[PDB]
């Protein structure tokens, strides 16, 4: 038979409802159909969410897809926990252990705390919009004690649309006083586009500035505005476009016309829409495991009223929750596995970074491993260090008190060692001291015509410079270049 479900969509979730219907037609199978009843409402209103939940509950559904806000999350988790209806959601994962709520959004408290340590920040601003709990602000403040962080938290989300420019430009003038160059933008797309419009306008997208965008949606804003300028911006991505399942999806996603699928004719999908697409895979695969293991369930003749007295559970509901949490699919976001609370485990968050070419994956974060860097750090560039030849003469170069205990240039001291430090500082290179193997200065054999010593290590190619007591001679400057004498004798 077909399976009745419900949908709580916001008024403005055009792409999310478009990606919902795309996932409908792709994961449907002749055996059973997930016939929905879609309600549109505002999710910041707990009266509307109460009234729409009870319309879905009276009209016999088996699970409710939907979104919630800060205002409605406690209406949702209470109704679903009490009436044993399951709720599947792309919204923020709840702060708690709520039954009958399956969270499709992974978590980025752990990944964001790993990335601040990776850049070794210890003083930074944190701009937060309220907007979905306040739990990531609270997670960096609970860690700021034991990680030695000085965090400047600014509420950036009470701002209205007519004093927008005046509030933000006055905001970064305050941080300018404290020399804040490191900022985390814990906002969503529409708010993070407004902030990067203002950091460009007042010239804070230049070098010296670092930005971390604490979304799961790094390449969902307009990053081409801040891509040149010099500021380093970093972020997180759960939708890897360099995967086979995603690239096959973008193929059919980009060809859709924006009359039957608004917000679809493009090559990037928002992560909340990717999780809406993945949630149809999760529901369908779980209702397939419902009819597979012969657990066959009916709703009731009436479903009663949500505000019943007493409101009674229904024993089939525990099975449906347990079936929704055993799902082990692969979706646009990666591995979709839930724990017993309904929160995603075994997931991956790609740590991106904006370069002049574009956004560049510089690693990932897994729950079990940690932040894992990926293989691209081999191709940066390096300094091209300079090999410098010396010789053991006191006091020019002579080995220090502990030869073997020290490693590198620090094995050596003397006049020419202090001279090599001064030549390198003015020219601008990095050097690696090297005693000449033959332990000689350089002379030419009458038969073989081969230059020995530090001279032949410059004539033939072993070295680039010879800082030494090396006498400026006629027969030597025919084959090498001396400077003016640093010591007359």
Ligand X SMILES: O=c1[nH]c2cc(C(F)(F)F)c(N3CCOCC3)cc2n(CP(=O)(O)O)c1=O
* Residue 252 assigned ligand-binding role: no
Closer to ligand X by CB, 266 or 471: give it. 471
Burial 176-191 (b: 16+ CB within 10 A, else e): eeeebbbbbbbbbbeb
Q: According to the binding rule CB under 8 A, does residue 78 interact with a copy of itself?
A: yes
Restricted to residues 155-194, the positions that interact with a copy of itself (CB under 8 A) are: 155, 169, 174-175, 177
Of 465, 313, 343, 372, the C-alpha closest to 93 is 343
Residue 88: CB atoms within 10 A of its CB come to 25
Q: Is 229 exposed, middle or buried (0-12, 13-18, 19+ CB in 10 A)?
A: middle
* Residue 476 assigned ligand-binding role: yes
Closer to ligand X by CB, 106 or 453: give it. 453
Closer to a copy of itself by CB, 15 or 72: give it. 72
Q: According to the binding rule CB under 8 A, does residue 81 interact with a copy of itself?
A: yes
Contacts of 335 (CB under 8 A, 6+ apart): 346, 347, 348
Q: Taking contact as CB under 8 A, which single stretch among the options 252-260, 306-314, 329-337, 470-478 is the one that binds a copy of itself?
A: 306-314
Question: Tokens 């084959």 label which residue?
Answer: 479
Of 306, 375, 332, the C-alpha closest to 242 is 332
Q: Which DSSP category does 37 fall into?
A: E
Q: According to the binding rule CB under 8 A, does residue 270 interact with a copy of itself?
A: no
Q: According to the binding rule CB under 8 A, does residue 403 interact with a copy of itself?
A: no
Closer to a copy of itself by CB, 155 or 385: give it. 155
Residue 147: CB atoms within 10 A of its CB come to 14
Structure tokens at 95: 């702060």
Is 84 within 8 Å of 318 (Cβ atoms)?
yes
* Residue 385 assigned ligand-binding role: no
Closer to a copy of itself by CB, 172 or 364: give it. 172
Q: Which DSSP category does 243 fall into?
A: S
Strand order from edge to edge, sheet including 328-331: 328-331, 334-338, 344-345
Q: According to the binding rule CB under 8 A, does residue 263 interact with a copy of itself?
A: no
For ligand X, which residue has the nearest CB?
Answer: 469
The interface partner of residue 150, options being a copy of itself, ligand X, none and the CB cut-off 5 to 8 Å by kind, is a copy of itself
Residues near a copy of itself (CB under 8 A): 45-47, 50-51, 54-55, 70-72, 74-75, 78-79, 81-83, 134, 138, 141-142, 144-146, 148, 150, 152-155, 169, 174-175, 177, 200-203, 205-207, 225, 228-231, 307, 309, 311
- Tell me the binding residues for L-glutamate: 469, 471, 476
């Amino acid at each position: 038979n077909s399976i009745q479900i419900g949908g709580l969509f916001p008024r403005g979730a055009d792409q999310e409802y478009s990606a919902f219907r795309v996932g409908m037609v792709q994961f449907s199978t002749s055996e059973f159909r997930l016939t929905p009843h879609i309600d549109n409402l505002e999710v910041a209103n707990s009266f509307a969410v109460t009234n729409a939940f009870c319309s879905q509950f009276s009209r016999g559904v088996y699970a409710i897809f939907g979104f919630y806000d800060k205002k409605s999350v406690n209406t949702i988790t209470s109704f679903c926990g009490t009436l044993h209806v399951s709720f599947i959601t792309p919204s923020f994962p709840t702060d708690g252990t709520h039954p009958f709520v399956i969270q499709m959004r992974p978590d980025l408290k752990g990944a964001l705390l790993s990335l601040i340590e990776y850049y070794q920040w210890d003083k930074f601003a944190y701009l937060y919009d309220s907007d979905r709990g306040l739990s990531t602000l609270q997670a960096v403040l609970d860690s700021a004690a034991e990680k030695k962080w000085q965090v400047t938290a600014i509420n950036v989300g009470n701002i209205n649309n007519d004093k927008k420019d005046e509030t933000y430009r006055s905001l970064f003038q305050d941080l300018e006083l404290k020399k804040e160059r490191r900022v985390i933008l814990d906002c969503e797309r529409d708010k993070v586009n407004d902030i990067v419009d203002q950091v460009i306008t007042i010239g804070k997208h230049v070098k010296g500035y670092h930005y971390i965008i604490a979304n799961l949606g790094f390449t969902d804003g307009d990053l081409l505005k801040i891509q040149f300028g010099g500021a380093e911006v970093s972020g997180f991505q759960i939708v890897d476009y360099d995967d086979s399942l995603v690239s096959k999806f973008i193929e059919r996603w980009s060809t859709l016309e924006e009359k039957e699928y608004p917000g679809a004719h493009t090559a990037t999908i928002k992560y909340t829409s990717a999780l809406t697409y993945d949630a149809v895979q999760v529901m369908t695969e779980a209702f397939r495991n419902l009819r597979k293991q012969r657990i066959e369930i009916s709703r009731r003749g009436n479903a009663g009223d949500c505000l019943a007295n007493p409101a009674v559970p229904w024993g089939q509901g525990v099975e449906i929750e347990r079936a929704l949490k055993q799902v082990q699919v692969e979706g646009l976001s990666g591995n979709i596995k839930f724990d017993q609370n309904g929160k995603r485990i075994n997931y991956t968050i790609n740590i991106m970074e904006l370069k002049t070419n574009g956004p560049r994956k510089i690693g990932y974060w897994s729950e079990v491993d940690k932040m894992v860097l990926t293989e691209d750090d081999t191709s940066g560039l390096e300094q091209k260090t300079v090999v410098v030849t010396t010789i053991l003469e006191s006091p020019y170069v002579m080995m220090k008190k502990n030869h073997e205990m020290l490693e590198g240039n620090e094995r050596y001291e003397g006049y020419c060692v202090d001279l090599a430090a001064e030549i390198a500082k003015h020219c601008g290179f990095k050097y690696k001291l090297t005693i000449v193997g033959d332990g000689k200065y350089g002379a030419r054999d009458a038969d073989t015509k081969i230059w020995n010593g530090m001279v032949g290590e410059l004539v033939y190619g072993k070295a680039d410079i010879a800082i030494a007591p090396l006498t400026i001679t006629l027969v030597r400057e025919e084959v090498i270049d001396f400077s003016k004498p640093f010591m007359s004798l």
